[PDB]
Every structure is written in C-alpha cells, then in structure tokens.
C-alpha cells in the first residue's frame, strides 16, 4: 500500500541533452556521456563547457547581426569569408541532431527497431510518460486548452497580414510541393508514420515514393518520364496512360487527370505546377546526357537524372530558398566540400517534430488572384484545367507577384485551412510531445519565464495563461505560431533556431553530399556536375518554358 | 557500317579507384576525383600520395611485424600504443569501402535506387560490361573453365590439412552462424539479392529478419524469449510454440523442431547450439535489468537487451573472432571511441564480394568427433536430437577440441560441401565479377605477374594457366582460396588484405558504435553497459551452463 510514486522523470531533471533513466521504484539516473555538462542533473559545467556556455552570443543577438549593416556583409560574400562562415553554421546546426536517430513514436530509448525500421518518425526529445500528474509532465492544468478554441482564438486569421520579407505565393507552393516527398503521414496507419521512407530530398514526389509507381510514371525511351504535349506544351501524362492510383476529384475524366508522383499534387494547380516544371526539366536533362552518352541505355539515363535532380533541388533550397526565408545578408552557400573536414553522417531520419514547425498555413493568401481576375478558394481547388488554361508561364509569374501570409505572431491562418491547425493540435497531443519550454532547453535556448515575454503584448498573454496555468506547460505549436516575431522578419524566435537544425541536417545529410558520390562521374560528367551547380529557380523555369516571366521569392519593389 | 568498337572500360583504364564513365562512342573518361592521383589514368600521383606511396610497407611486409618477436608486443599490449595502433587499424582499413554503397548488382554507376533499395548486395568494383571480348574483359579465353573441374582439380580434399593457427571446430560453427545473418540469399527473387536487410550486426538470426517472426519468437513476458525447459536445461522453443515457419525436414515431429531467428539453423547440432546459447544468454541479460529496473515494461526489456547482445557480439568478434583469425600478437581491441576522432559512417551495405571471400567451408572437417564416439557428416546433418542428447556444455567442449582445416592453398574443402564451391563459381560469373588481379589493385596490391607467384609451386600454376590463359583474368573465387598460404597461417594475403577492410567496416560501422547510441543510458545503465565490455566466448558458455567445459578457438596444447 502507497499513494503510486510520481515517475521522476516527469520533472524533466536532466538538462543540456541528459536521458533521464529510471532506476528502481522511484528513483531517476541522468547520463550525461558527451553531454559536455556533469552532477546528478548534467548541470555542473566541464572545463571546455564553462568557457563556451560564458562565451556563446544571445540567439535573438547572432540574428541581429546577420541583418544589419549590409557594408560589412559586402566583403563576407567576395572573400573566402564566406566559405569559412558556411562551414561553421552546417557544423554547428547540425550538432544538435542525433547522428543515428535516437528515438521514434514508439520507443522512448536506443533500439534496434528505431534505428532499422524506417516506416517510423523519429524524435529529438522522448514523450510525457502516460503515469505524470499533468498531460504536460507536472506542470499545468489537468486538461489540455481547446483545440478549435484555441486555434480560433490565436491562430484564426482576422485580416491578411502581409510578410515583412515580401515572401510570394510562389514560396508557398514551391514549400507545399517540396515537403510532401517527406511529410506523408499513413491514414491507415496512424499519426505517427510516414510512406516517405526515403527520409530527405530523394524527390519521391516526383518519381513515386515505392518502385512500382516508378515504372508506372517512366516512358522507358531515353530514360525520359512520360510527357502528354497539350497544344504545343509539355505536361505530365494523363492518368490512363499512367495507371498509378491518383487522388483526383470522382467524376472528372482521365483525360483531365494528370499522373505525378505524388497522389495529391492534382488538387492544386500551384502543385501541378511544380509537378510539370520538373518533369519539364527531368525530360530536358535527358537530352543532354544523351548527348554526352550515346552508349547509355534506359535505366542510366534516368538514374543519373534523378541524383542531377537532387541536386539542384538541394542548391536551390540551400541559397535561395532558406536565403530568402532567413532574410541574412549573408549569402548562404551549398558546397558539400565545406563539411569534408568534419565527421558528418550522410544519413537523414524525418522527426516528427520538423513535421510539426513546418506548418506554415499562415502563407496561403486570402484570395489567389492570377493576373487579370482573382480566383477563391473553391474556384482555385481541384481545378483540373487551370494549369493547363494559362501555361507554366502564366502560373508561375502570377505567384512571384503576390505577397504572402506572416507565420508567427499567430492570427495569420485563412480560415479555409484552419482545420489543419487543429489537426496538428490534436496530433501533438497524441504524439504527447514535451512543452515549447521544454524544447528551446533542447535548442540552446532559456525557457520563458512569463507569456508576455513570449507573444509581446499584454493581452494575448493574459488568456494563454488562463488557458495553460504555466508558461512550462505551453504545447510546442501555439508557443511556435504565437511566439512574437522578430522587427520586420517572417516569424519568431523559436522558429529560426529549431528550424535551421532540421533543414540543413535534412540537406547536407544526403549521400549525393558525401565525399563518394560527389563527383562529376556520379552525374554522367562534367556537364551534369555544373547542372547542379548555378541552377537557380529562373534556370527552372525559363528553360523550360517558351518565354522567361518573372519568376523569384520577392514582389518587385 | 563499322565493326562496333570495343567497349574502352574492358580494359580497366583507370587507376586507383578510378571511374570509368563512357564518353561518345569509343572513348573514356577516367575520373580521378579524390583518388589521390590525376592524369588521363589516374595514374600520375600528387604531392601527398607520392610521398605516401614511396614510403607503404609491402602488405606482405606488415604481416611479418605482427607474427614475430613477441617481446615487443608485450610492451605495445601494456601500454597507450595499442590503443593509438587500434586506431590506426580501424581507420586505414575502412577507407577503402565506400561511405554510402556505390553500386549494386543491377547498377554499375550512383544511383538513388542503388542508395535506398536495401534489399540489394552492394559492391565495390563494377562487373565488366556485356560488350567485352572476353567474358573476364580483355584478357583470357572465350570461355571460362569448367566449374566443376575447377572444384574437383583444386578445391576439392585428398585428405585432411588442419590449420596451422590450430583453429577449432568451435570456431567453424561460430563462423556459419554468426554470418547467416547478413548472408540469406533469397532463392526466388535470384543471386545478387539479400532477405537480410539488416546489413550488419542486426543479430536478425536471434530475433528473426522480420517483424512478425519476431512477434512468434517472442514471449512477451519480461521481454524474454519464448523458451523451452528440457530435462532442467532451457532450449529455445519448440516450433509448434513459436509457429514460425523452420526448414526442418518432413516428418520429424514439432516435439523435436525448435524454433529460433534463421530458417536454416535447425539443420545443424552446432548452428542450433550457438542459438541455444544467445536464447539463454538473452533470457539471462532479461533478469539482470528487471532487477534494475523493476519499472520497466515489457517492449524495454527485449529492445534493450537486443543492443546489449548486438554489443557483445561485436565485442566477441573484433577481440577473440578475429583475432584468432589474424594471429596477431598485437592484441584487438574494441573501442568506439578509437573513431571518435575520424569522420567515419556508422552506416553499412553487404557487399557481394565479402559473401565471396567469407565461403571457408575447408574449415568443416572429414568428420564430427564429439567424445566418445565419431558422427559421419550424413549422422551429423539434420540431427534433431544431438543437442538435447549432449547438452550445450557437451558439444561446446567436443567443438573446441577437434581442430578444422585451412582456407588458402586449396584441396582443403570435404567433398560433401564441394557443392557449395560450384555455386559460387557460377554465381561469381552470373554477377560478373572483375579477376582477381583487378580487386588487388583495388585493395592495395600490385597484381600477380605469373601464376606461380600465386599458387606457389609449378604444377598447380602449369594447369591453371592452360585452363584461364592469363594471370590477368583468373576469377575472383580461385585465386583465393588457391593462393599459396602465408607460413603457418590460415589463408593467403589476399584473403587477409580484402577480408579485414568488410569486417571493420562492417563491425565499427554500427550504430550503437557511434558516439550517439556508446551511452551506458543505451544499455540500460551502468549494470548493462558493463555486460558489453568484459563479454568473452568463454563468459557466454559458462554463464548459461550448469558447468564449465573447455571452451575457446584454438585446441590445447
Ligand atoms: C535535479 O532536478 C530535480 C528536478 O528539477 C530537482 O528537483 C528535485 O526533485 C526531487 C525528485 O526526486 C525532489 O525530491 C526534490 O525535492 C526536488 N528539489 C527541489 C529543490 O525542488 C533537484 O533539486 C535537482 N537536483 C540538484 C542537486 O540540483
Ligand atoms: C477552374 O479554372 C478555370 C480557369 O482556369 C475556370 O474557368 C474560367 O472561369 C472564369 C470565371 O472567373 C471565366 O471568366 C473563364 O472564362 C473560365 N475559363 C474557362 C476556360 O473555363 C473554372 O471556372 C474553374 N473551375 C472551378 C470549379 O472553379
Ligand atoms: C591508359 O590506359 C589504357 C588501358 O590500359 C592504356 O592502353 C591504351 O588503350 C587505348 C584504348 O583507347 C589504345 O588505343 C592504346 O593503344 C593503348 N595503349 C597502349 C600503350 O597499349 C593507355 O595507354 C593508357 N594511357 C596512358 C597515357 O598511359
Ligand atoms: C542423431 O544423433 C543421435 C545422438 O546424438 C544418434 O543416436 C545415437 O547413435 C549412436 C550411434 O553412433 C548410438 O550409439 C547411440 O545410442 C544413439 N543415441 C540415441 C539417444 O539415439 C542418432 O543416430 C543420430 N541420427 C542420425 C540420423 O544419424
């Protein structure tokens, strides 16, 4: 007989990456192996530790001196400056992701079935044991906050509020189209499982996350991908004649249907779009190695396109996708070269947080206007005929000329796309991930002491706290959307600092970044090696269509 | 009209790991990146390997310092040297296998398919192309020796050579079952596919290459596998309690079959005694964590003690496997933090060329004498009741009592198992392996110029030139295991110099070798990190016996 001791790792006791282990009944044991930090809580600071942690800038301080005094970042972008400071943020971002994944949804700890079964999400911090006096570990309410509630509340749009950094639609959908060949989460299944098992860029929504959609997408002529030309230009082929099972609306013909990799692409026509610009640009680069190779069969042509392919969209995310979205006037560089000195596993693992503070809804705009008249949103999807109604050419200047939505601050989310935010709400609660506190500890960051601190005003502050009752029992969704955003940027805090981590770890990690493949052969020569290098997002789309429109991340200012 | 140009790469053109991409239609293109040396072969030396080249021992050469003038040894074992040496062994030897698997048995170039299709054996020469003159590439005849002939004229045994280095049978059994569980051929898909996606040290011939043999397998009380109490000692179960499907033959009654991870073990006395042996081990690591950690559930107790048993067998590998193997009085040592220091993939693909080398079925000998009496090979196989009728403490001591025989040389395989060398000629020719010649010079070896320099004596090299025609294209599986053996050694130079680059690679390249999993938390604290360390063979028998018999590789002298 006894009142059931509290499990002590509720209290989260161990800090600066300690695992808390349960030992006995009632008793934890905190393992601070290369934690840097040693005691029975990793709090007491070794010799090399002591100087960097009295040594290491403010995180909202680093920011402020990558977007300021633009004289100075001049000189940084033309010396080798450049390379040495590029070689310094992969090395230190990528330190806070585990080299082998440590956890998933499932185990809590180092198995064997988390590291080899790849149908899982893993994760960076271990969930709330079931057997804790709060949802949220000790601190709290006793009932989590509403989910709609909540997401009416703070994250419900009440008027568009424009991005500072003038970030456009063509951002939002090239973010959308790009995510989903990782971010695939089982319906089947559960929450916690993803038909990506590539677990990075391998473009799966492009070529088909299994082997069987592979064949079922390819011509097997030239290694080219099957193309349908429709009045003069080239789109991805009809269902029919690609029988690969789409999620197209019941009713509309297949004539109208478009087979890609992805199943949802053809909801969009900002999905299709992108969808049509790589198979544009997947056909193209088969002409070229045609060329080089005469001696080449089928299968060379297109497995030498698809690492081509990686390729580029690895440098376009890396030097104007992240650039754009970080706003540094620091240009960001993709050189796998910079990482040969240090030890860094070319393996990648989705963790089901990066899922998680991907959720930029907040872009999507209130309308999509394309050129003359301005589409809703039940006009805009499912359209079957609008991608191929204006052309690439139309589409894809249409979006690099409206503004997008700001993500922080909350209060930014269309109300059509609400529901999402409360699925993610809901997920996270059944994934039982630790609090927005708990996580900036994890990404060498304090926790927040009060909720003014947190979303800036007095007002907001005061009902998130009736809501939660404590500021360590903040889920990690509403402290990431609500969080106040930095003078004139996209979103707070919080966001650049887990985001980073994620992304470049998620890039450099791709064994094409690896000293072994690395090479012009892997590319079918030097004219397939500088395919990757100088592609930009216009070479995107200006050389795969009939005229060049203006195509970029920014409205014209 | 012309007369179709011979292919450029049959010739092996380039040099020191050198790619071989086609260009147009008759010429090459060498690409020397990273491979130390530059020129249209890669075969002008830079700065750096030019010096490194004129100052490498002969591989013959560092042989020698390791098997002579034990005093120095001694000295080396006893202080930081070793640990300095170590990793200097670890480091060198795992240069050579690429860090992501570069090619498969269906791609000869980088491919994503080649990367993330892990149900392929990798490779590290590519196979020589089917436009080649000759079937080795350019050199030779038109047609390979007889596979038969080749088995019975140098393979098969006159009579019975013993190993030198006195290895046991304890050692052959260990063998077969410690590599079952990255080598599983899978008869329908064909020759150069693996059901052992694990590619490593998984132990998936203890819990099953599967998920759902796993489940059957398991007891799911106390994470304890199901076992099987006979007459007071513990067996593992019998197939009707663990329904898993066993390649035991007709008609022996379930009572008599036992279940366990491999399909195939069930068919030998001494692969079912080693998994006799890991079941009790497993059932025995069981109860010393639920002591520590009475609050622990049933998933906990089994994944944990699956990495502390992946633990000791690396341990039991790299410090007594191998080392028996090596001879070396330099003492092995397994130490993840040896490779703290070097950027090294904890990450490892099979390669089909380490399935080669590793056929050292000249080990099993003319027949199995365990005590008293002497089983015939047709006594020995498919003995249901042998292991029951003896015990695990009975036939561990007969097995490392009666020495095996040696690998190189030749006629030393037993002519029930020559079979299993037919298979291997012909699979060797249907992956189209490059000669034995073109792997040394990949491995660090300049190429033999005669063949009395391989076999040693005139009257072997006098047949085996008129059967192949040139030293430049005998196969890969000959000149292996034909090679004329180092003085009292096991196997030949080649054997040990392509051997000892898979095997590292292979051990260290685990996961739970890397600084993130090498946590005492890993294992279940201190109690279970400590059972890694420390593990030895003669600790795995005599801790799961009622007694404790004779147990080591080498026979007492
Ligand atoms: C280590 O961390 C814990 C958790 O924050 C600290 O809190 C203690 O938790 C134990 C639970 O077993 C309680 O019995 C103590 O009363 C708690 N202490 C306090 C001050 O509240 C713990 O103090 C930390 N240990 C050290 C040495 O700082
Ligand atoms: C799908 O998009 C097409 C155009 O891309 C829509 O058709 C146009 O609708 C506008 C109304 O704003 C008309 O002015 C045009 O004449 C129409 N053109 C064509 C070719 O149809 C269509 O209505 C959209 N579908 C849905 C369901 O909204
Ligand atoms: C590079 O390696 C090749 C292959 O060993 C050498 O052999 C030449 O191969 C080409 C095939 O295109 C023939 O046309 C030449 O006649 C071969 N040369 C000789 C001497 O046999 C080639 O010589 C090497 N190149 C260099 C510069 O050493
Ligand atoms: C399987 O092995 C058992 C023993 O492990 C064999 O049975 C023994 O055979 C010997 C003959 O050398 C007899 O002297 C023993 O009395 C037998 N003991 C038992 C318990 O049967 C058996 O013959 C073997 N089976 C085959 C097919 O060879």
Redesign the interface.
Same mark, same amino acid.
């Given at each position: 007989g006894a009142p059931t001791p509290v499990?002590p790792c509720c209290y989260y006791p161990c800090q600066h990456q300690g695992?808390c282990?349960?030992?006995?009944?009632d008793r934890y044991?905190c393992?601070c192996?290369?934690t840097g930090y040693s005691g029975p809580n990793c709090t007491i600071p070794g010799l090399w530790t002591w100087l960097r942690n009295s040594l290491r800038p403010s995180p909202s301080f680093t920011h402020f001196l990558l977007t300021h005094g633009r004289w100075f970042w001049e000189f940084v972008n033309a010396t080798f400056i450049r390379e040495m400071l590029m070689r310094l943020v992969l090395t230190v971002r990528s330190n806070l992701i585990?080299?082998?994944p440590?956890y998933n949804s499932?185990?809590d700890?180092?198995?064997?079935?988390?590291?080899?079964?790849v149908s899982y999400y893993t994760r960076i911090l271990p969930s709330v044991p079931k057997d804790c006096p709060t949802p949220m570990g000790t601190k709290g309410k006793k009932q989590l906050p509403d989910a709609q509630l909540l997401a009416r509340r703070f994250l419900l749009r009440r008027k568009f509020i424009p991005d500072p950094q003038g970030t456009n639609l063509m951002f939002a959908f090239f973010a959308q189209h790009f995510t989903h060949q990782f971010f695939k989460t089982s319906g089947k299944m559960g929450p916690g499982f993803t038909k990506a098992?590539?677990h990075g860029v391998?473009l799966g929504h492009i070529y088909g996350d299994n *082997?069987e959609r592979q064949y079922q997408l390819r011509l097997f002529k030239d290694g080219k991908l099957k193309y349908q030309v429709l009045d003069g230009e080239m789109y991805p082929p009809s269902v029919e004649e690609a029988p690969v099972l789409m999620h197209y609306p019941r009713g509309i013909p297949p004539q109208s249907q478009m087979a890609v990799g992805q199943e949802v692409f053809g909801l969009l026509p900002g999905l299709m779009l992108y969808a049509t610009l790589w198979l544009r640009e997947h056909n193209r680069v088969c002409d070229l190695l045609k060329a080089?190779?005469?001696?080449?069969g089928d299968?060379?042509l297109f497995?030498?396109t698809? *690492?081509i392919l990686?390729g580029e969209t690895i440098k376009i995310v890396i030097e104007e996708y992240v650039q754009q979205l970080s706003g540094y006037f620091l240009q960001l560089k993709f050189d796998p070269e910079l990482l040969?000195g240090?030890?860094?596993?070319?393996?990648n693992r989705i963790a089901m947080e990066f899922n998680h503070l991907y959720h930029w809804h907040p872009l999507m705009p209130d309308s999509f206007k394309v050129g003359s008249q301005e589409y809703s949103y039940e006009q805009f999807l499912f359209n079957t005929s609008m991608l191929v109604d204006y052309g690439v050419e139309a589409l894809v200047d249409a979006f690099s000329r409206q503004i997008a939505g700001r993500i922080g601050g909350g209060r930014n989310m269309d109300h059509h796309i609400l529901h999402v935010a409360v699925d993610v709400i809901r997920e996270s609660r059944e994934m039982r991930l630790q609090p927005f506190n708990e996580y900036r500890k994890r990404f060498g960051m304090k926790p927040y002491t009060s909720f003014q601190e947190l979303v800036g005003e007095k007002e907001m502050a005061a009902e998130l706290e009736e809501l939660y009752g404590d500021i360590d029992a903040l889920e990690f969704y509403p402290g990431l959307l609500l969080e106040k955003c930095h003078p004139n940027s996209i979103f707070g805090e919080s966001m650049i600092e887990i985001g980073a981590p994620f992304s470049l770890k998620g890039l450099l990690g791709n064994?094409?970044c690896?000293?072994?493949?690395?090479?012009?052969?892997?590319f079918?020569?030097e004219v397939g090696f500088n395919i990757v290098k100088t592609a930009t997002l216009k070479k995107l789309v200006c050389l795969n269509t009939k005229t060049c429109p203006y195509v970029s991340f920014r409205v014209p200012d």
């Open positions: 499990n695992i282990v349960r030992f006995g009944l044991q393992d192996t290369r585990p080299s082998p440590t499932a185990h700890y180092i198995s064997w079935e988390s590291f080899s079964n098992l590539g391998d *082997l080089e190779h005469p001696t080449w299968e060379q497995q030498t698809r *690492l990686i040969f240090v030890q860094f596993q070319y393996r064994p094409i690896s000293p072994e493949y690395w090479k012009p052969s892997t079918g020569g």
